[PDB]
Curated annotation (Swiss-Prot), chain B:
Function, in words: Cellular uptake of iron occurs via receptor-mediated endocytosis of ligand-occupied transferrin receptor into specialized endosomes. Endosomal acidification leads to iron release. The apotransferrin-receptor complex is then recycled to the cell surface with a return to neutral pH and the concomitant loss of affinity of apotransferrin for its receptor. Transferrin receptor is necessary for development of erythrocytes and the nervous system. A second ligand, the hereditary hemochromatosis protein HFE, competes for binding with transferrin for an overlapping C-terminal binding site. (Microbial infection) Acts as a receptor for new-world arenaviruses: Guanarito, Junin and Machupo virus.
Miscellaneous remark of the record: Serum transferrin receptor (sTfR) is used as a means of detecting erythropoietin (EPO) misuse by athletes and as a diagnostic test for anemia resulting from a number of conditions including rheumatoid arthritis, pregnancy, irritable bowel syndrome and in HIV patients. Canine and feline parvoviruses bind human and feline transferrin receptors and use these receptors to enter and infect cells.
Family: Belongs to the peptidase M28 family. M28B subfamily.
Cellular localization per UniProt: Cell membrane; Melanosome
Stated name of the protein: Transferrin receptor protein 1
Organism: Homo sapiens (Human)
UniProt subunit comment: Homodimer; disulfide-linked. Binds one transferrin or HFE molecule per subunit. Binds the HLA class II histocompatibility antigen, DR1. Interacts with SH3BP3. Interacts with STEAP3; facilitates TFRC endocytosis in erythroid precursor cells. Interacts with GRM2. (Microbial infection) Interacts with Guanarito, Junin and Machupo arenavirus glycoprotein complex.
Associated pathology: Immunodeficiency 46: An autosomal recessive primary immunodeficiency disorder characterized by early-onset chronic diarrhea, recurrent infections, hypo- or agammaglobulinemia, normal lymphocyte counts, intermittent neutropenia, and intermittent thrombocytopenia.
Post-translational modification: Stearoylated by ZDHHC6 which inhibits TFRC-mediated activation of the JNK pathway and promotes mitochondrial fragmentation. Stearoylation does not affect iron uptake.
Induction notes from the record: Regulated by cellular iron levels through binding of the iron regulatory proteins, IRP1 and IRP2, to iron-responsive elements in the 3'-UTR. Up-regulated upon mitogenic stimulation.
Amino acid sequence: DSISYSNFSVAENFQKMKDYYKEIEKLKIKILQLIEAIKKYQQHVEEL
Amino acid sequence: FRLYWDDLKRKLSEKLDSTDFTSTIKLLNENSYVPRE
């Protein structure tokens, strides 16, 4: 009966952890495209 | 006969002495009633 009580709050904790992992995926995309930008940038300043 | 005040006081203590509220508070927290908007 006590685990049956605890489910109600545990579900919200797991939900928020899922949300933060979605944020981590978006920041992984951003860090990838920014690093690719910096690589082409050093190619640019090497051209200058 | 009639009943006066002190009879009602001691009778409420006698009848209220027996019952247990703990199961009912446990029953109103059952999986059949736990979210209540």
